[PDB]
Amino acid sequence: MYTFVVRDENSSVYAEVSRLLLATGQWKRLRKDNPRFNLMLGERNRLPFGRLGHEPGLVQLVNYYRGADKLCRKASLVKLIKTSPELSESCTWFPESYVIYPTDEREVFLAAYNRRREGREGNVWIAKSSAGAKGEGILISSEASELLDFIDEQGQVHVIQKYLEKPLLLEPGHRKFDIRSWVLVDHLYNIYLYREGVLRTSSEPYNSANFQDKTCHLTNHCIQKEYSKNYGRYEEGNEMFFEEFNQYLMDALNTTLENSILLQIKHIIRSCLMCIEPAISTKHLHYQSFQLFGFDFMVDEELKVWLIEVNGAPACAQKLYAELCQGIVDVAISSVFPLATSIFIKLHH
Amino acid sequence: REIVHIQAGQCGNQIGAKFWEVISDEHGIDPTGSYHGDSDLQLERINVYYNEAAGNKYVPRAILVDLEPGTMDSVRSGPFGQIFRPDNFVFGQSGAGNNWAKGHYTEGAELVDSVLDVVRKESESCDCLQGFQLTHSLGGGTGSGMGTLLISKIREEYPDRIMNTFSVVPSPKVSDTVVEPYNATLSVHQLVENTDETYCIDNEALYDICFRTLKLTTPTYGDLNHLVSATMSGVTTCLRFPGQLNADLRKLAVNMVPFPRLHFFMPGFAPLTSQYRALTVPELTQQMFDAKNMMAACDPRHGRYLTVAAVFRGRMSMKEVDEQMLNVQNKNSSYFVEWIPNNVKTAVCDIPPRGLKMSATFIGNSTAIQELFKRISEQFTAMFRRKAFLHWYTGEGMDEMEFTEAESNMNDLVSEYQQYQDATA
Amino acid sequence: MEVIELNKCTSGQSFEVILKPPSDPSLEEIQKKLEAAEERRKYQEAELLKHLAEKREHEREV
Amino acid sequence: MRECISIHVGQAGVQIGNACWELYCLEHGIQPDGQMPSDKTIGGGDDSFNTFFSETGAGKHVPRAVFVDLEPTVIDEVRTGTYRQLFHPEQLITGKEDAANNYARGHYTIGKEIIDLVLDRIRKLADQCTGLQGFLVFHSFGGGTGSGFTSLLMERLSVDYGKKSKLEFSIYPAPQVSTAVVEPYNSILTTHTTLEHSDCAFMVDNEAIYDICRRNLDIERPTYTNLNRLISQIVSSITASLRFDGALNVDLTEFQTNLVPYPRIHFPLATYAPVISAEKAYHEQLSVAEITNACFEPANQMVKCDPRHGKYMACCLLYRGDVVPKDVNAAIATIKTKRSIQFVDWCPTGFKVGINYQPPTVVPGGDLAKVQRAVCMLSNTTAIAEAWARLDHKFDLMYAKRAFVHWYVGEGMEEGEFSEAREDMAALEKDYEEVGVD
Ligand SMILES: Nc1nc2c(ncn2[C@@H]2O[C@H](COP(=O)(O)OP(=O)(O)OP(=O)(O)O)[C@@H](O)[C@H]2O)c(=O)[nH]1
Ligand SMILES: Nc1ncnc2c1ncn2[C@@H]1O[C@H](COP(=O)(O)OP(=O)(O)CP(=O)(O)O)[C@@H](O)[C@H]1O
Ligand SMILES: COc1cccc(-c2cc(N3CCc4cc(OC)c(OC)cc4C3)nc(N)n2)c1
Ligand SMILES: Nc1nc2c(ncn2[C@@H]2O[C@H](COP(=O)(O)OP(=O)(O)O)[C@@H](O)[C@H]2O)c(=O)[nH]1
Ligand SMILES: [Ca+2]
Ligand SMILES: [Ca+2]
Ligand SMILES: [Ca+2]
Ligand SMILES: [Ca+2]
Ligand SMILES: [Mg+2]
Ligand SMILES: [Mg+2]
Ligand SMILES: [Mg+2]
């Protein structure tokens, strides 16, 4: 029977996967450093890809795609989109973003801000960086000087991205949101979209004139639960699931989630992952790879979808751990190591 | 690269005689020393254990030692008795009375010089001496006491040559006398320092195998020796036949012994015989890793493997042995140390033994071998705390403080085996 | 994709295609160490034969 | 003309040398008795093949080679084999007992006893050279002779032939075909002491050759004979520029100039295609673009690793057979638009290409099929460092417990050399990290 190893202790998702593989009766867990394994639930940093696929007579699988960081680091993602002919600077679903080191794009960022300033176009901007987690490291302003000054104050890379001033606002609440989608890519590079997403909801009413407040413009669950008094006023945990959001769109705007938003989502997922397919694919490699991705989108008031970031080590929604984690084993693991309807939308390419 | 064989004492000379019977058959040499074989592959590496002599005869490079003529008189009259060089019988008259001190310090000391004289002559006619192998028991007096004495004298004259032994370990279930744990403990201290490889053949295991698995309600020493000679044929098979891989005693020791003192191996054999059904590779592999096929009464699941070597003989689906070897490891991957990578090696010799189409020999350096020494240490202390039977030894000049030292070193040996059973990466 | 320095003969050809331009020990010192390991080898051997010599004393002491 | 002397050390080196020289003779139309009907310069000449073969008045063509093993059974097969007549006795040097996979035994204990004789016999061939270029040393990382004595030989060759280039063909250890667990120790030890003395080393992982043989030749359990005849093809393609008329890689110095910008990082990755079975009676011959594309499939590399996640410092395309420059450029243009090929910023993004019109030669009754065209790509990519990491990790696991170390100390070594060599590999691994990441 098959063997596997855990090398990430702080992993919510794969904690259940190792839990559920053990209960199968055909899987055996080993120490964090026994190479005689079939599957590696590897670590988020410096995973030793070079030491995989060199154990005789052992098919070796790993839950991460070497090189997928180029899509999951904010600075690299920008350069991937802007320098990839498959995506190009003419990208309709990515906000005009620039990579700013405190190679560099400082002038060219000011270049459009000036043209925009003279044109009375709401030149409101946001700066971000992958290092600052837990809602720390985030600045929004209307003129570069105040933003670029924050970038130089720190010592790591930062990207300046056009803050979207006209988000789709839910009612009752007149409040903001983002959408999280989970996508599984298996060893064959089939793209599987989990049929269940979630809206991370803002519990405070949107305010365009006032970004002084540090909770009316960000909604990563953690921020709302620690810096907002209305965590849960409308729905359990600032998390609205698709059934409800679909019904809301039908009633309020006479459309469906599938038509108005989810088509654009499926297109962006395919576009992003197929752009990098030749650089990370492991089809003829001595080891195979799969990986779970968490795409974060947002919707504007014209029902256009925008990709904001891609997270390569994502947590799941509490209710959906069981179903999702069972889906990985079915498609990602058992597909390689067979045993004695579906929850995924196969994004065909 | 020639090997010099030595057999000392009753046990040593009798398992030795069967060893020469077996390999002599495998190579096609009759009791008179004449080759009558079908393949030239039998002869390519025949020099390894035989000299070529006047009249196109092959003579075993063997030396026969005992302090009493009884067992050696039998050998000369046995099946292959006339194969050995008559000049290589060096036997005393008095005996050792199952007394380690008599073989090591008094009676043996008198005869030892005569033994090394024969060693030198065998060594002087060797193109490139590779090392020595000794067959002997650790419970008697000649094989145990004199055998470890000879080992000490050989290392003095050939300090850069490999010294290996097939040592039969005593057990109350197949016991000749009660002072057997005393002689064993004293011998082991010598083997820990002056041998490179010791194959621990435990008579308890040979009995259980003969009685429990082979369904022999009353085994004889002949029944146990059939298994011991079968193992020795299997351990030496790669050296005795033109085998794809290049097997050398020092190259083998380097790959099997990660620490100088932990050089005590568990032999194994499969199938266990005393039938015609072709045994399949699935069956050969799972047997050799079973406790029931081990020649040392130790549970491999109560320890860990430092190194392992499984040796397969015959024409067989070699792709299948690989598939299965890699299968049996996955089933027992917890019982292989993680800090010696790729510590399970496999060799195949196309020529099977006599009467079997496929066989397999197992050589393992497992930390569970301590269970044997712990068993011997208990029997030793049970008597030593009351100093029982010591007068047999103090009467030959020994001091009880040599006993205390030996006891301590073997409990040290156990402690060292425990160190690496718990070590991790 | 420029092709340059194309040489050719009856046996074959060779050339270069560019797509994007750029953006002491001595003998004595050895001999000593082989000897330094040799002398270390002898010391281990002497220490062995001394340990054995000590055990020859004890043998005939008994 | 400028001569090259091949030195084959240990079992692996010797047996691979047998494969290469067998192949060389067939490629040059030399018979096993050393006669060459096509050579009209009797008793001499400065032709291109003379870089590897000398000529006698009797018309025999003799490899400029030395074989050396610390035990004779392997070289004995040379002295009695098909090409026994090719070599004369003093070219073949043998000891009596081997190094038992012990680097220390090969370098120190036994090395000291035989080094002088070997050098003397090498000097006897250098004296027959008008303009010796350097040495090609074939050996294994794992064996005691191949690792320990080779390093000793390399050290003294740098002293006695100071300004002459030295190239290595090194067999990287693989569990599938090895019977030794200490090979990681010998690999790190020999690399450390040989690194400063080698100008260019072509490393071949036996794991790569093993899978290539069973995947592409459907051989269920390859032998050393299977592996060596495949390796010889690659070795031949690499050395063909020295033996045939040409413009690219005609001096050993050019290998260093074309493939090695930094001295320490001198391990080019070889990739070879097409490998085709002789059992497939009729095969769809592969185009120039298909075999050139195949040069970027890790399954065809001599060392399993992912160049996509490293950076290139140089690249040479060595075609043999019916190839013309136009078809090469077509493939390269297509390939660059479909593959992840990033060069370091301080080097040009270009390929140095060479073509010999003679198609690859296969030994009669071999496992390989004759093909219309083949290519061997030589790439200096940082991704090859993966092989060092693998090895460094195995070294670390055993050394933390000092497993097997007593076998080396007993032969005269100090534990310091273990950590001293391992520290050198640490720098080397970090040197590769500097050049190719971020
Ligand atoms: N490709 C290939 N590798 C070989 C061959 N023979 C040995 N090797 C490699 O070398 C290792 C065994 O050591 P050898 O090279 O045979 O021995 P050595 O280098 O002469 O050193 P000693 O045997 O100790 O004298 C194996 O693990 C292989 O990796 C061969 O014929 N072909
Ligand atoms: N272009 C844009 N327009 C509007 N809002 C934006 C935006 N870019 C970022 N945001 C805000 O920032 C938040 C997401 O930040 P981001 O996802 O980059 O931080 P993060 O990656 O550290 C949290 P996680 O790791 O859980 O994804 C959202 O709540 C969103 O409101
Ligand atoms: C008592 O004196 C002797 C005499 C003859 C042999 C031995 C012996 C055998 C042995 N066997 C058998 C063959 C073999 C071959 C291998 O590869 C080529 C291998 O892997 C390196 C392991 C084995 C396992 N192992 C050790 N240590 N000694 C001892
Ligand atoms: N396997 C086997 N073991 C034996 C044989 N004879 C004796 N022994 C073992 O050796 C012990 C007796 O020692 P003995 O052979 O008399 O030693 P000796 O005095 O040197 O010949 C017993 O405990 C047995 O375990 C034999 O024929 N076969
Ligand atoms: Ca007397
Ligand atoms: Ca004398
Ligand atoms: Ca000529
Ligand atoms: Ca130099
Ligand atoms: Mg993030
Ligand atoms: Mg008796
Ligand atoms: Mg050898």
Side-chain angles (χ1 to χ4, degrees), chain D residues 204-217:
Chain D
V204 180
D205 191 339
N206 266 341
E207 188 180 80
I209 313 307
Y210 192 82
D211 280 324
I212 290 162
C213 280
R214 47 198 205 94
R215 192 199 317 113
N216 294 341
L217 312 178

mmCIF file of all heavy atoms in Angstrom, chain D residues 204-217:
data_model
loop_
_atom_site.group_PDB
_atom_site.id
_atom_site.type_symbol
_atom_site.label_atom_id
_atom_site.label_comp_id
_atom_site.label_asym_id
_atom_site.label_seq_id
_atom_site.Cartn_x
_atom_site.Cartn_y
_atom_site.Cartn_z
ATOM 1 N N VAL D 204 27.928 11.816 -16.112
ATOM 2 C CA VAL D 204 26.911 10.907 -16.633
ATOM 3 C C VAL D 204 26.308 10.144 -15.461
ATOM 4 O O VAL D 204 26.981 9.308 -14.847
ATOM 5 C CB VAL D 204 27.487 9.933 -17.673
ATOM 6 C CG1 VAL D 204 26.399 9.007 -18.198
ATOM 7 C CG2 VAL D 204 28.136 10.696 -18.818
ATOM 8 N N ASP D 205 25.043 10.423 -15.154
ATOM 9 C CA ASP D 205 24.337 9.710 -14.099
ATOM 10 C C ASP D 205 23.859 8.365 -14.633
ATOM 11 O O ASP D 205 23.105 8.312 -15.612
ATOM 12 C CB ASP D 205 23.160 10.533 -13.584
ATOM 13 C CG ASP D 205 22.553 9.952 -12.313
ATOM 14 O OD1 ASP D 205 22.748 8.743 -12.052
ATOM 15 O OD2 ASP D 205 21.915 10.714 -11.551
ATOM 16 N N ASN D 206 24.300 7.280 -13.988
ATOM 17 C CA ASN D 206 23.884 5.945 -14.407
ATOM 18 C C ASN D 206 22.372 5.784 -14.351
ATOM 19 O O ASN D 206 21.809 4.960 -15.079
ATOM 20 C CB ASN D 206 24.554 4.887 -13.536
ATOM 21 C CG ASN D 206 25.836 4.369 -14.140
ATOM 22 O OD1 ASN D 206 26.075 4.519 -15.334
ATOM 23 N ND2 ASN D 206 26.669 3.748 -13.318
ATOM 24 N N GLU D 207 21.699 6.548 -13.490
ATOM 25 C CA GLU D 207 20.243 6.513 -13.472
ATOM 26 C C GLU D 207 19.684 6.926 -14.824
ATOM 27 O O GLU D 207 18.784 6.270 -15.360
ATOM 28 C CB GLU D 207 19.719 7.446 -12.379
ATOM 29 C CG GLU D 207 18.220 7.369 -12.130
ATOM 30 C CD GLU D 207 17.757 8.319 -11.032
ATOM 31 O OE1 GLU D 207 17.586 9.527 -11.317
ATOM 32 O OE2 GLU D 207 17.571 7.863 -9.883
ATOM 33 N N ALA D 208 20.240 7.987 -15.411
ATOM 34 C CA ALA D 208 19.773 8.448 -16.713
ATOM 35 C C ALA D 208 19.980 7.384 -17.782
ATOM 36 O O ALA D 208 19.064 7.071 -18.548
ATOM 37 C CB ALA D 208 20.491 9.741 -17.098
ATOM 38 N N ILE D 209 21.182 6.810 -17.843
ATOM 39 C CA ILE D 209 21.466 5.808 -18.865
ATOM 40 C C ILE D 209 20.591 4.576 -18.669
ATOM 41 O O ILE D 209 20.192 3.921 -19.640
ATOM 42 C CB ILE D 209 22.955 5.423 -18.838
ATOM 43 C CG1 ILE D 209 23.848 6.656 -18.771
ATOM 44 C CG2 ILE D 209 23.316 4.637 -20.085
ATOM 45 C CD1 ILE D 209 23.575 7.672 -19.840
ATOM 46 N N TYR D 210 20.304 4.226 -17.411
ATOM 47 C CA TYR D 210 19.488 3.048 -17.125
ATOM 48 C C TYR D 210 18.080 3.195 -17.684
ATOM 49 O O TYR D 210 17.602 2.328 -18.425
ATOM 50 C CB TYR D 210 19.439 2.816 -15.611
ATOM 51 C CG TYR D 210 18.875 1.477 -15.183
ATOM 52 C CD1 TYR D 210 19.665 0.334 -15.183
ATOM 53 C CD2 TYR D 210 17.559 1.364 -14.750
ATOM 54 C CE1 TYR D 210 19.155 -0.887 -14.783
ATOM 55 C CE2 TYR D 210 17.042 0.149 -14.345
ATOM 56 C CZ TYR D 210 17.842 -0.971 -14.362
ATOM 57 O OH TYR D 210 17.322 -2.178 -13.958
ATOM 58 N N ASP D 211 17.402 4.295 -17.350
ATOM 59 C CA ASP D 211 16.036 4.488 -17.825
ATOM 60 C C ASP D 211 16.000 4.658 -19.335
ATOM 61 O O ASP D 211 15.121 4.105 -20.005
ATOM 62 C CB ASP D 211 15.395 5.683 -17.122
ATOM 63 C CG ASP D 211 14.896 5.333 -15.732
ATOM 64 O OD1 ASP D 211 14.409 4.192 -15.552
ATOM 65 O OD2 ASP D 211 15.043 6.167 -14.812
ATOM 66 N N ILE D 212 16.949 5.413 -19.889
ATOM 67 C CA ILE D 212 16.988 5.593 -21.335
ATOM 68 C C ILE D 212 17.081 4.239 -22.021
ATOM 69 O O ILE D 212 16.396 3.985 -23.019
ATOM 70 C CB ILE D 212 18.155 6.519 -21.727
ATOM 71 C CG1 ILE D 212 17.869 7.957 -21.282
ATOM 72 C CG2 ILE D 212 18.398 6.472 -23.222
ATOM 73 C CD1 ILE D 212 19.094 8.843 -21.228
ATOM 74 N N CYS D 213 17.895 3.330 -21.476
ATOM 75 C CA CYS D 213 18.023 2.019 -22.101
ATOM 76 C C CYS D 213 16.714 1.242 -22.052
ATOM 77 O O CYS D 213 16.321 0.625 -23.046
ATOM 78 C CB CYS D 213 19.141 1.210 -21.444
ATOM 79 S SG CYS D 213 20.812 1.642 -21.995
ATOM 80 N N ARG D 214 16.018 1.246 -20.917
ATOM 81 C CA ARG D 214 14.796 0.447 -20.873
ATOM 82 C C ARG D 214 13.607 1.165 -21.507
ATOM 83 O O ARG D 214 12.723 0.503 -22.062
ATOM 84 C CB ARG D 214 14.479 -0.018 -19.451
ATOM 85 C CG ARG D 214 14.539 0.969 -18.325
ATOM 86 C CD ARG D 214 14.628 0.141 -17.042
ATOM 87 N NE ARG D 214 14.134 0.818 -15.846
ATOM 88 C CZ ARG D 214 12.892 0.714 -15.372
ATOM 89 N NH1 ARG D 214 11.989 -0.038 -15.994
ATOM 90 N NH2 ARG D 214 12.554 1.369 -14.266
ATOM 91 N N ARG D 215 13.566 2.500 -21.458
ATOM 92 C CA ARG D 215 12.437 3.220 -22.039
ATOM 93 C C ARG D 215 12.536 3.248 -23.561
ATOM 94 O O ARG D 215 11.556 2.972 -24.263
ATOM 95 C CB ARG D 215 12.389 4.654 -21.502
ATOM 96 C CG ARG D 215 11.096 5.403 -21.818
ATOM 97 C CD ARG D 215 11.244 6.926 -21.697
ATOM 98 N NE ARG D 215 12.011 7.326 -20.515
ATOM 99 C CZ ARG D 215 13.215 7.905 -20.547
ATOM 100 N NH1 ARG D 215 13.808 8.182 -21.702
ATOM 101 N NH2 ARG D 215 13.830 8.220 -19.415
ATOM 102 N N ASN D 216 13.719 3.576 -24.086
ATOM 103 C CA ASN D 216 13.906 3.778 -25.516
ATOM 104 C C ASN D 216 14.474 2.563 -26.235
ATOM 105 O O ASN D 216 14.396 2.508 -27.467
ATOM 106 C CB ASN D 216 14.809 4.991 -25.757
ATOM 107 C CG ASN D 216 14.156 6.277 -25.314
ATOM 108 O OD1 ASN D 216 12.939 6.335 -25.164
ATOM 109 N ND2 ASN D 216 14.952 7.311 -25.098
ATOM 110 N N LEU D 217 15.042 1.595 -25.513
ATOM 111 C CA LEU D 217 15.487 0.351 -26.125
ATOM 112 C C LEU D 217 14.713 -0.854 -25.605
ATOM 113 O O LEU D 217 15.023 -1.986 -25.996
ATOM 114 C CB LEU D 217 16.986 0.118 -25.875
ATOM 115 C CG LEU D 217 17.976 1.259 -26.129
ATOM 116 C CD1 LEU D 217 19.389 0.824 -25.772
ATOM 117 C CD2 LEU D 217 17.922 1.751 -27.563
#
